[PDB]
Assembly symmetry: C2
Homo-oligomer: 171 residues x 2
């Protein structure tokens, strides 16, 4: 009968309802999975960025170590040179004081010169002959210093080249 | 006479005095000159140190530029992927709502199932057919990302090598 065709239609539609209910749950599950997958993508990315930052921090530590070393070599050269000059300064003080002493001896005999015995006493002073001072050349190691500067420039340009090539790998 | 030998000695000794006075002035001017040369050495040294610091400051600027570039590339990959997922989320919402709409239409006709005209009205609904939803394949470029990481490590070890060579060039 038509009551049978109608109860049949009802059964069909309710079965459809249960199927579509499960398919909707499927779509919900999928929406969640999508947002989750996105957040996992983000986390992965940030992790990699943080690793990069680690490598660059080490690279900067290397640069600092180098710069400190080179700086030390330069200040050592300066130190060596200015020490030589220090020695020289001492030597000059010693010469000056010596000459000043002979000067005062002479002036002495000249003050008590009208005594008869002036000739007897001062002819020995006729002898002493003093020299003028000079300053030895002291030369800073220009080749060492210019070598360091230049090589540091070289290092920079090598680094520039390397970076260029890296970024090149990733156009 | 001995008065002549004495006036002679006097002339000699006084000449010596003036010479020694000049030589002493010489030694003072020489001490100052030495101090000048030392100051010049220091200035040269500090100058060179400042130049070094310049090159290292530029090298750090280069590292920063690179790191920023690489970071950007990684974030670009992340953004590409999460955009695809956003599009997918929209598509999924649309499918879900579509199935949900058919579901509510069916449920509606079922609220009128005890009406005589139910069979007439709902057989068309017997038509309805819906499918399950899925997420398509979408993956992060792991080769690109790991390649950037690895190449950055490479860069670090190259730089390390170069620095080593520089410092060994100035032994």
């Amino acid at each position: 009968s038509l009551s049978q065709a109608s109860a049949d239609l009802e059964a069909t539609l309710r079965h459809k309802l249960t199927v579509m209910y499960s398919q909707i749950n499927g779509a919900s599950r999928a929406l969640d999975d999508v947002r989750n997958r996105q957040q996992d993508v983000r986390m992965t990315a940030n992790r990699k960025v943080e690793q990069l930052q680690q490598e660059y921090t080490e690279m900067k530590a290397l640069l600092d170590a180098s710069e400190t070393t080179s700086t030390r070599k330069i200040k050592e050269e300066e130190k060596r040179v200015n020490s030589k000059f220090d020695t020289i300064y001492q030597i000059l003080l010693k010469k000056k004081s010596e000459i000043q002493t002979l000067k005062e001896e002479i002036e002495q005999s000249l003050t008590k010169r009208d005594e008869f015995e002036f000739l007897e006493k001062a002819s020995k002073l006729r002898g002493i002959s003093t020299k003028p001072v000079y300053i030895p050349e002291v030369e800073l190691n220009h080749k060492l210093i210019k070598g360091i500067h230049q090589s540091t420039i070289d290092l920079k340009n090598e680094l520039k080249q390397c970076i260029g090539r890296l970024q090149e790998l990733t156009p």
